[PDB]
Amino acid sequence: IIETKMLMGEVMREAAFSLAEAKFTAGDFSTTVIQNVNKAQVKIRAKKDNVAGVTLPVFEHYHEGTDSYELTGLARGGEQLAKLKRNYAKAVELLVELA
């Protein structure tokens, strides 16, 4: 758990400086994104894990299907946003595993 948590920390830092570089090409995207909030593309599919005689609930990473939204107007910086999407997606996968 400690090892996977260290991987979590460094992957979060990956996503963090990816965001730092996304602050460059686009600009003030923060409020544009925070206002655009309609539906989720990632969901928790609760499963079970019979580890022993006692059963403990667990979780599964789900791609629901409604794709991540498209902001192509922020001064035309979509590439950085896409790589940031990839970073945070991988991070969230590892985080549901930790949960």
Binding site: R13, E21, F24, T25, E70, T72, A82
Partner: protein
Amino acid sequence: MSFFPELYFNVDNGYLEGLVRGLKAGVLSQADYLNLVQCETLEDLKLHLQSTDYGNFLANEASPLTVSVIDDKLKEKMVVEFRHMRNHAYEPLASFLDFITYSYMIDNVILLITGTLHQRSIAELVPKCHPLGSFEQMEAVNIAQTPAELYNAILVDTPLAAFFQDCISEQDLDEMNIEIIRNTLYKAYLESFYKFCTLLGGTTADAMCPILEFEADRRAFIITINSFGTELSKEDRAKLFPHCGRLYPEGLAQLARADDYEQVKNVADYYPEYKLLFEGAGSNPGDKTLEDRFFEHEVKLNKLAFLNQFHFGVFYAFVKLKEQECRNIVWIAECIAQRHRAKIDNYIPIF
């Protein structure tokens, strides 16, 4: 004008010319980036930047080291400085600076609209509103959150009503997402500014119109490029392509048919400067990308405008120059915070 410019040009351009030129003398060059790259901490960044136009801007404010307040203070000083400068303007340059004001009023309108759909007070959006789109007119705030009242009050209030009488219509806005709205407004504004500059022919047009032509062409490329991963129809792509570029007489139909990225490269191979720019896009870990090349060409044309002096581009290209100065300052700050020194010099300097 009429093959004899500068007759009485400088009558109403003296002090503003001197002010912009003096600030241009104080522009950070790579020499200052040679001592702003060896910082390792925001305190030394502040020490080095104390010798710039940014005098003590972090001393006696924000004692713990931060990045967001740096960006905010830079924006505040720079914007208020061009408010001062525009406030020392005269009617032609006032129209110019109004259009430069419009370039931000577009995204400020975009932020302030659809708040009816989420049923939120406009006074909650005023704090995040960028200062260069103030919309200093009555009854914008708290219109009963009805979209119709917003449309009518914005027609009444925002000086972008000249664009809105033939750019927006409330009913159509409801169907199209905001992604289309922002871009159609900016297309209309780009075309209007281009034409207005063309009417004032001279050094101004010949120097800034190629910048706007590059804006239109880079836009036409990027819309297609980043619309590979979407289901937007080509109809909106056509409605979003400016009609004041190198590609307006014909060439727009090709960028509707260049589905793959390599096809867009092939279409851009016909424009040799843009062919060099696309040949400079490596998209590899250690070199620059296509967006970086478009930005580099933009900077190059801004420099070419800066070469001349008897033009209205001294008062716009310099605004974007200050933008990029503030932007690189925030870059160095973000590299200090994240310790990502591998990309400490992965930006576009100025001169």
